[model samples]
Target chain A: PAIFTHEGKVEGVPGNYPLTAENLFRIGLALCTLWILDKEIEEPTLSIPETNFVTLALSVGFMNAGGSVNVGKGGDIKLFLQKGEIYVLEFQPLSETDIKKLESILFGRAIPKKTGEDIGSFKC
Target chain B: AIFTHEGKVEGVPGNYPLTAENLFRIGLALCTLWILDKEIEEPTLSIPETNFVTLALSVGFMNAGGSVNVGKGGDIKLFLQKGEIYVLEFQPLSETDIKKLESILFGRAPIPKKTGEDIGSFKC
Candidate 1:
């Protein structure tokens, strides 16, 4: 219900789009920790005129966060947030194997497992 | 050296006037051929049509050089650029988690191990 302003100048609100300044602000307020990286107001292709499109290379990784998998690894993590939107923005994975792992996790695919064991007795 | 109507061009003057502001109603149109193909490829988690529109419009706003708005009803100004911009977004990952994962995955951790009579035999 509050008016938004850009650089002290009055600006109108958003329509149709659900993500609003208020929404972002709320999320920002709720976040216990927030980080912004590589943020730059990129110049319009003055240097890289040949390329108009910026390649957003992405990579993925795994964690020991609890769901059932972290029974012994770690406890179930709970974010310190109430009544707000949480956004987790990360870059794309570089490794092909890592990528596959993430894709499997995101889309709920079973990760292929390979285990080889050699039987031997050692006296120490 | 010809002077620009809005102001005088400094340093190496460009051929055209810098302040070439005009009717700007910038809207982005994006289609996730990859995501769409993913649906066809796996048909597991279906992406909503609204999501596509959201990304398209969001990218469009970015293409127009519009930054984040933190309040309600902020006027979005459209700036015409000499070149175009393309935005690539990755979903389903948190920035913090990404950094954490990167450290785990990309960082120098313990190496894989194999200790047995047949372990070194593979190395010819």
Candidate 2:
């Protein structure tokens, strides 16, 4: 698991697919789609901590979709939005006492941006 | 009951599993909903839900200019009428398929059902 406090590149799986802000944005759209069709969750809640650090959860299996960053069979992922973009802020694997692992992972860094004004482009 | 489809996804041919990138994309869409949830249900301006996730969600987002649209399935429409889902019809998949898909999607310690439901296509 890991914890982040800013808007930057989050870890991607398999060491090739870079999980950029734009890529993450697309991923979000997908979750919302299935959330309705699956008859499971119509709207999963977001946690707004102090300073409005908008946070959303992710599952290892779901994240495993193009590939996987987590090796664990299951775990919880926490991502947050800052300055209008998203980043992987934390991860927690099942069946164990969690240890800080952000320092050990080879993750990507986010391309600098200002606001959500430009992220709306479909060209990404 | 009207039905003919279900979740997972449909973009390219062949068995393309849900990747980390795809999962993240789903979560990305959920981000907006999280905010919208707060702004609607609980309001701290806010409110929210889970499950009912389904296919081709990302497609609708791109077509609609950064808005959640799960309408490519035509029969399955995401409707918010007076704070309630308007309609949704899916091609019921096998119970085994659903569990398998869920197993892969969530990985473990999971979102449960009886088994077999990730029916992305017909008789695949």
Candidate 3:
């Protein structure tokens, strides 16, 4: 997986997905708006080494009927829109290892490990 | 309970085999199903929902060490402790069905419906 130094485009499954600050801002705005409506919903926490580069985690929460919002220096988030339904959204930073796993799994590169291969062996 | 979509046994055991990677994909497929179910049954958000949209949403949640819990199928737990993602399925999908579902999920197999053969209508 590529280590991102600054906001730019990253290779996706087929097309290129932007990792730019502008995109992040759009995400932050959406999250903040959703978070504000549901104050009781708990947000998932992602911890990474503090650095100039940005890391992300995606988490989902239960939203009733209204919108919610939350903002901070690290990230901003929002949820809510469906009435009596569950919606999915990104709300956290992903680790380097996860980035690799997803890339492998989705693109059909992930092969199942044999018996001797410990399940817990894969990590960053 | 027999798997039923529109009063049909859409969910059931199949002849396909299952593996770890297969399980991972099954979890993702089910998660995607739940996301889609919510968007269609009770949409309130302003954005147009699509497969790519749901993929983005689920991928984000997957990053945050989050899990999805369906109303009937229960929680699809995702553990990201120490940089490894472990998906535990609590939905009781038989091993045989998991593989069949995976094929249907990624567009490798046809669904039980005659409406169309696309990956859009394999319901809960």
The ten-residue window of minimal lDDT in model 2 chain B covers B115-124
Instruction: Go through the candidates in order and give each one's C-alpha lDDT.
Output: 0.19, 0.25, 0.26
Off by over 4 Å in 2: A1-100, A106-124, B1-15, B20-64, B69-124
**Which residues of candidate 1, in runs, are more than 4 Å off?**
A1-95, A98-124, B1-52, B76-124
What is the C-alpha lDDT profile of model 1 across B1-124, one tens digit per residue? 2122322222111112111010001121111111222232211111121111121223223332332221222222112222222122223323442343234323465212111111111000
DockQ agreement of candidate 1 with the native complex? 0.01
Instruction: Report the TM-score of candidate 3, chain B only.
Output: 0.29
Task: Give candidates' CA RMSD values in order.
Answer: 26.8, 18.3, 15.6
Ranking by lDDT: 3, 2, 1
A1-124 per-residue lDDT for model 2 (tens digits): 3423233224433111233223333333333323323324433222222111011112221222221122222312233322322223332221122121222222333211111111111100
Chain A accuracy as TM-score for every candidate: 0.18, 0.28, 0.26
- Per residue, candidate 3 scores C-alpha lDDT tens digits across A10-115 of 3211101332222332333233223343234333222222111112211111111111112222322222211112212232334454345333432442222212
In model 3, where do residues sit more than 4 Å from their true spots? A1-46, A49-124, B1-24, B35-89, B95-100, B109-124
Ranking by DockQ: 3, 2, 1
Model 3 TM-score (2 dp) = 0.25
lDDT of 3 by residue, B61-118 (tens): 2322223221223233222112122112323345554444445556855222111111
- Candidate 1: C-alpha RMSD to true structure equals 26.8
True contacts kept of 2: 0.04
Who wins the TM-score comparison? 3
